Write a protein that binds this ligand. Structure first.
Ligand SMILES: O=C(CCCc1ccccc1)NO
Ligand SMILES: O=C(CCCc1ccccc1)NO
Ligand SMILES: [Ca+2]
Ligand SMILES: [Ca+2]
Ligand SMILES: [Ca+2]
Ligand SMILES: [Ca+2]
Lengths: 121, 121, 121, 121
C-alpha cells in the first residue's frame, strides 16, 4: 500500500503514508543503488567494508536502508522485512532513511525504490 | 511459508516447498552476501559492473538472486518481489538460484537468506 | 485474529481485542442461532419479517449481529464482512452486539460465534 | 478473488473461478435469503427445523450453502469459512450449491451472495 523512493542525500528521510499500529504485520521490499560518498554504489544493505563513525543506525552498515516508526530510534530495513512485527511500545508513521553519519549526507547520491504493505494478522 | 538459504556455489539452486499455482500472489525477501569468485561480496542484486559472459539469467546482474517456477526460464528476484503474479502457463515448485555462468559455480562463496510466502488473492 | 461468542441476552455486547485503525481491511464471519423472544431461532442476519420498534441498529433486522468501532454508531455485520474498510473515519476496539430494542434483551436466547481477522492492505 | 450469486433452484450449483490447490487457505462469506419450497426464506445456515429427507449434504441443514472442491463430497459452508484448509487430496474448482434433495430443486427460490478469497500461507 505505499510505493516510493528514498534519496541517499536526504538526512530527514522520506515520510511514508504507512502508520504502524500495535499488532501490525508489515512487509518491506527495497531495491536500487546508492552511495554515501565514494565513487561506487551499494544496494540497500550498504557497504560492509566501511567502518561506523557515528551512523544513525549502529545495527546496519553505512549506506543501508533504515527506518523510524513514529519517534522510535532507527530500525534496520536493508533489502526488506518479511511479515515483521515491531517491538512493544513502537507505533506511528514509518520514515525511511539512508544510513549515514549526521552532517555527511551532502556527498550522497542515488536512491532506493521501496514497497511497504500491511499483511494479514 | 518457506525460509532458507541459497548457496552461491550450488549450480542446481535450492528447490523450495512453495508450489506456484495460477493466480497465486507471492512475496519474496532476500538478504545476505555472496561472491561469483572475487574476494568482495555483493548483495542479492549482484555486481552491476561485471559483464554477462553467459549468465543463466540475462535480465539480472552476475551474483543476483533469480528463480525458476517449475521448468520456466529464469526470472529475476534480486532483493525480492512484492505481491507478484506470474505470466500465463507458469506453474510448479519455486527453485532459487545464484546467477552465474554454467560450469563456473565452483569458485563461488556465501549465500542469500530468503523468505517466500503466498499473499492474499 | 479474534475468535469468540456474543450472547443474544447481553445488552452491553462483547468487547473484542481487535482495534480497528484507519485504513484497516477486516474480515468477519459469524455463525449460530439466536432469538429476540419468539420460540423460533434466526441466524446472524436476524428476522427480515419483524418490524423495527427501536433497534440499536436501524440498518439491520431484529436479531442481526451488529458492531461498534470504539464509540461509533452501530454497523451491520450480519453473516460477516469480506475485506471490509470502514466507510467513515472510525477507530477503536470492535464491540459485537445482538440487534434488539434496549430493555427487551431479557427474553433473548442463543449466541453467535464470530471470527475477526485483519487482511492485507 | 470471486464474488457472485448461487441460485437455490440451480441443482448443478454455481462453478466459481476459484481453484482450490493443496495448502491453500480460503475465506468465504455468504449472505442472503432462499427457500427450498415454503413461502418463508432462510439464511445460508438453512432451516434447523426441517428434517433431512436425502439432502446432497447430510452435515448441513436443508437450505444451507454447501460446496464441492473438484469432484469432492459436499462440504458445509453455511455463513462462511474463516481461514480454512481442506482435508488431504481435495483439489479443483469450487462449486457452490444449495443444500436440497436431488430432484426437488424446481420449487426453490432466492439466492445467496458469496465472496471467496485466498488468504496468506
Ligand atoms: O560522507 C561521508 C564521509 C566521507 C565518505 C567518503 C569516503 C571516501 C571517499 C569519498 C567519500 N560519509 O558518509
Ligand atoms: O423482546 C422483544 C419484544 C417482544 C418480541 C416477542 C414477540 C413474540 C413472542 C415473544 C417475543 N423484542 O426483542
Ligand atoms: Ca556521506
Ligand atoms: Ca563463479
Ligand atoms: Ca427481546
Ligand atoms: Ca425444494
Amino acid at each position: 500500500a505505499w510505493k516510493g523512493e528514498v534519496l541517499a542525500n536526504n538526512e530527514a528521510g522520506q515520510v511514508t503514508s504507512i502508520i504502524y499500529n500495535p499488532g501490525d504485520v508489515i512487509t518491506i521490499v527495497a531495491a536500487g543503488w546508492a552511495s554515501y560518498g565514494p565513487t561506487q554504489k551499494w544496494g540497500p544493505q550498504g557497504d560492509r567494508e566501511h567502518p561506523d563513525q557515528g551512523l544513525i543506525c549502529h545495527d546496519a552498515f553505512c549506506g543501508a536502508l533504515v527506518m523510524k516508526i513514529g519517534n522510535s530510534g532507527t530500525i534496520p530495513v536493508n533489502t526488506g522485512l518479511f511479515r515483521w512485527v515491531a517491538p512493544n511500545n513502537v507505533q506511528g508513521a514509518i520514515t525511511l532513511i539512508y544510513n549515514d553519519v549526521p552532517g555527511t549526507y551532502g556527498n550522497n547520491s542515488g536512491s532506493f525504490s521501496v514497497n511497504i504493505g500491511k499483511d494479514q494478522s
